[PDB]
Symmetry: D2
Subunit: 237 residues, 4 copies
């Protein structure tokens, strides 16, 4: 089915499918079993920031996650994305809850993509930045339980009125326009993504996490991907 | 039908519908009869550059058209776009030919839009830049005879293989994603558009012109808008 | 002496030199007696945001000042800056206190300037953004009592350790590199400046204000410009 | 003396100081003896483009050099710049000629630097872009024989009126403002530089090359650095 490349912010350790024994950040290339992970000192109720970068010369996907006044976590993986994804993709955010839960709120999201050709001055670029989400955000495709406009935020998974997070929820938000990540005459292709999130849970064991992902343009939530599968994969293979 | 705001680069003087007696640039608010025009010293076969700017504080749409080594032409019009267009629009390029013709080639196109909120640091932005167009440009909606990929260019109206422009042709290209130009808490909204074009005709009387336009998101080419109506209006009212 | 163009955030009404009877925003072209002003509902202790824009086609300097959850204030003035300032200038922030006082803290400052030539694709640009100021900010020229690094902020006027603002203080911060605002082949020149500030005073009558200004590159604080003269002018003419 | 990190475009093979037997691109960390090099198919009289990128997470300096209609050359080197350069640096372009010569013309130059803090939304950035150089470019420090304004270009080494390049020439151009490349709370620091150049020589054996470099802020041309030492190093160690 879908082709997924994702950076996961995994809040619950599912050691049975390969997660380390703590909250962690990981790089997923077509499988929920991360190719690489780093321990993440997740802070319930605090606003964090994730930064994701990549370029076609180095062929290394790197991510940094931090909280104000704290040391940051970083994970990197060598991978040639031209060999994994199609030339046209869509980028988005995904999150899920299962038996354990949490709010998966997005307060801001920016993305920049650049394709530099061998022609003198030939640069194709795409940049979007949301610091405020409105009730009817026509430039986003919302899937599953994702909603916008609440407090000017993006709520990826269900939250009840009292502001409480609901279990077994899954939601994704994708930028409306397709993104071009390869071109036959490109000499350098690169992208950078930043998002700020608020993960809060009334429980000691929050679950499941948030992921930034890149997929085929027609990607949709796979059946039964609530919980540990982050709304990205159909199974744990 | 559609709601159109356009900056026209009108190459043929249709004095019967209000055009001045020379090639000119004009600002069209819902009608082909420009609200304002300026004489334009059009240069057959030369690459020109058009710059369009606007902001919600000044409420003035201004455009500058120039050619290398030449004096530029400029036209400005006071208009509050919040009172003319919907909150969500699509931006694009349109061109036509009729009994007289010309090539309407686009070599590059960039657009930036910004919505600054009253919240501290709340900026929503959209930026795209094409310096090269590919055969299958999934982030553009091509309408009518518009095609991409020829010489890495965007051909808005039909050109035969030998490179000759065809008469009675009409084509438009729109950026795929909707653009947000008003938000209830916005303190300043602004946009800027730049495009470079090559208008060439084997004839002494080239026709009809190229226009940068902003419209309702579902805008489509009105019937019989070839020729003097630039692929934007259904009639000359 | 110096040539000054400034947007003032005037917190104290010096009706004897032309200020309206309330806190106001104004546009100063070579004199502290603003060419234009608008009433400003100044909020003691709240973080505000000022946005300043200008372009050589419209020849209109406009500014918008707002606070979160509040209506904004705006002032505009028609002026051709090519006829007032030199081709090379420096941009900066200035503030003062006199018998009455206040803190003049800058939490962030961004500036973008663009010169678009008539050559195809000829754009010269300069952009800087500070969201954090460090103790030794080598890209700023600090004049008078201005200091950086305190809380990652820029303090334009003196504040004692307990955090209290001092009277008769004056300070300015200028971006190190000269800015080019005119070029003989330019078709459009424009700039945009944004800054967020925190004006706080233990008193009912805070004074004197903060100004964004543009000046000759070698501008320095005029003698006796504390108080009502905002660190910008030598006298009240 | 100076601390230099440079990307060289070396046009003459000085095999006696370690150059490969052909024109090449190389990464120089404090010595003219490149840490890494790649063969470069240099094209006399054609306009080329160099792209340089780096980020503090990956710690890899990479460069790509290309000509229109040709395959590009690329070289990469793992290096932690925080361990080699000071926290504040200046960036620039340098070139030289010796017994053999060539024109070292720069037609455009852009640079972007970003420091992302662990504070939510804390980004410091600097960006400059020159597509046209004027006779009196006050935002550049010109050293040695470098001159601006000729044809709107930057001439790094001496060219006589007839347009002929002179031997034993050396020149550098540095951006006026210091650049901040490290900050104690930074989570990611990165930069990207692009320049287009025209190397032309009436001779079969052009010499010496052009380099993009990063140095201590007070760097100056070392004595006797004409020729093979590219205006960057005092000797061949
Ligand atoms: Mn898990
Ligand atoms: Mn995991
Ligand atoms: Mn006409
Ligand atoms: Mn007309
Ligand atoms: Mn006053
Ligand atoms: Mn005043
Ligand atoms: Mn050499
Ligand atoms: Mn070498």
């Amino acid at each position: 089915a879908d082709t997924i490349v994702a950076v996961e912010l995994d809040t619950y350790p599912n050691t049975d499918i390969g997660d380390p024994s703590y909250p962690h950040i990981g790089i997923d290339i077509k499988s929920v079993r991360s190719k690489k992970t780093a321990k993440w000192n997740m802070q319930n109720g605090k606003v964090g920031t994730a930064h994701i970068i990549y370029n076609s010369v180095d062929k290394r996907l790197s991510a940094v996650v931090s909280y104000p006044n704290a040391d940051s976590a970083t994970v990197s993986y060598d991978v040639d994305l031209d060999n994994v994804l199609p030339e046209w993709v869509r980028v988005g955010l995904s999150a899920s809850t299962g038996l354990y839960k949490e709010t998966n709120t997005i307060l801001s999201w920016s993305f920049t993509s650049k394709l530099k050709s061998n022609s003198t001055h030939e640069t194709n670029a795409l940049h979007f930045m949301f610091n405020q989400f409105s009730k009817d955000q026509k430039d986003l495709i919302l899937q599953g339980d994702a909603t916008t406009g609440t407090d000017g935020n993006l709520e990826l998974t269900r939250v009840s009125s009292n502001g409480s997070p609901q279990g077994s929820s899954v939601g994704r938000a994708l930028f409306y326009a397709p993104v071009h990540i390869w071109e036959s005459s490109a000499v350098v292709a690169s992208f950078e993504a930043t998002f700020t999130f608020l993960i809060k849970s009334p429980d000691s064991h929050p679950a499941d996490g948030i992921a930034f992902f890149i997929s085929n343009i027609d990607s949709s939530i796979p059946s039964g991907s609530t919980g540990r599968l982050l709304g990205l994969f159909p199974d744990a293979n």
